[PDB]
């Protein structure tokens, strides 16, 4: 068991700043754990992942895709994840242009599909998975696929008729009309993806169970906005490794290499 907990944050080029910025986390953790903390910020994901693998980071904060890579190479466990919009998970919604006569995923056969950014989960990878798993529809092959830039652009492109359907974040679609981006009488929801996970905090499994248990309780109980605002989080809530299978499965289905 390390005398001082090595708590790594997201990788960053300005390590001194991000460490200073997150002093409220250091102070919150020392007081609540009764243990000294050393904050760590790595130049890239490979450094972080390998340093944890070899016992030189104790707790670490990852992106979900990054977490899945870290887990394949080392005995770690997630114990909390970022809460935003009331939970540590989110969905994608598929919407359809009302006038296009698309009533079901299957009807996207030979139609136009709007996606956000090639790299987005909520506006590309997730909605693409849904179409494949549910209707055996492959992008490029069984429908025409347009990448239009952002989540707002998906909603707009579907609503104004330039696509028949599109996939975006549930959360963002839910205020697209509120913000006046679209007429809500021109689109309807076809359905939702499963729940995908947010940024996990993860720890090395061979820390003592006394420490591990206490770590998890402390992080889950953080209510200090000065700590939380740096993660753009309302809270941290329990999460487990099993909550990232839906990402593993998405990798496979689409043939993604996370590096």
Author numbering: 5 to 263
Which statements did the authors publish about this structure?
In our study, numerous attempts to crystallise apo forms of Te_PtxB and Pm_PhnD were unsuccessful, but a 2.1 Å resolution structure of Pseudomonas stutuzi PtxB (Ps_PtxB) in an open conformation was determined. Analysis of the conformational change between the open and closed, phosphite-bound structure of Ps_PtxB using DynDom42 revealed that domain closure is induced by a ~60° rotation around an axis that lies between the two lobes. This is facilitated by flexible loops that form the hinge region between the lobes (residues A85-T93 and Y200-Q202), as well as residues from the extreme end of the C-terminal helix (G255-L258). Superposition of the individual lobes of Ps_PtxB in the open and closed conformations shows that lobe 2 (residues 96–196, 0.35 Å RMSD cα) adopts a very similar structure, with the conserved STS-H motif (S124, T125, S126 and H155) spatially conserved in both conformations. In contrast, lobe 1 (residues 1–84 and 202–255, 1.55 Å RMSD cα) shows some differences between the open and ligand-bound states. The positions of Y94, which hydrogen bonds to one of the phosphite oxygen atoms in the closed structure, and D16, which hydrogen bonds to and stabilises the capping tyrosine in the closed structure, move ~7 Å and ~4.5 Å (cα-cα), respectively, on ligand binding. Y94 resides on the hinge region, the conformation of which alters substantially during domain closure, whilst D16 sits on a flexible loop that latches over the binding pocket in the closed conformation. In addition, the B-factors of the core residues in lobe 2 are much lower in the closed, ligand bound, conformation compared to those in the open structure, implying lower overall flexibility when phosphite is bound to the protein.
Here we elucidate the molecular basis of high-affinity phosphite and hypophosphite acquisition by determining the ligand-binding affinity and structure of the PBPs of phosphite and hypophosphite ABC transporters from environmental microorganisms. We over-produced and purified PBPs of three putative phosphite transporters; PtxB from the globally important marine diazotroph Trichodesmium erythraeum IMS101 (Te_PtxB), PhnD from the oceanic picocyanobacteria Prochlorococcus marinus MIT9301 (Pm_PhnD)35 and PtxB from the soil bacterium Pseudomonas stutzeri WM88 (Ps_PtxB), as well as a PBP from a putative hypophosphite transporter, HtxB, also from P. stutzeri WM88 (HtxB)18. The structures reveal that ligand specificity, measured here by thermophoresis, arises from a combination of steric considerations and the interaction between a ligand P-H hydrogen atom and an aromatic π system in the binding pocket. The structures of two distinct types of phosphite-binding protein and a hypophosphite-binding protein reveal that a P-H…π interaction ensures high-affinity binding of specific ligands, representing a universal mechanism in these PBPs for recognising ligands with a P-H bond.
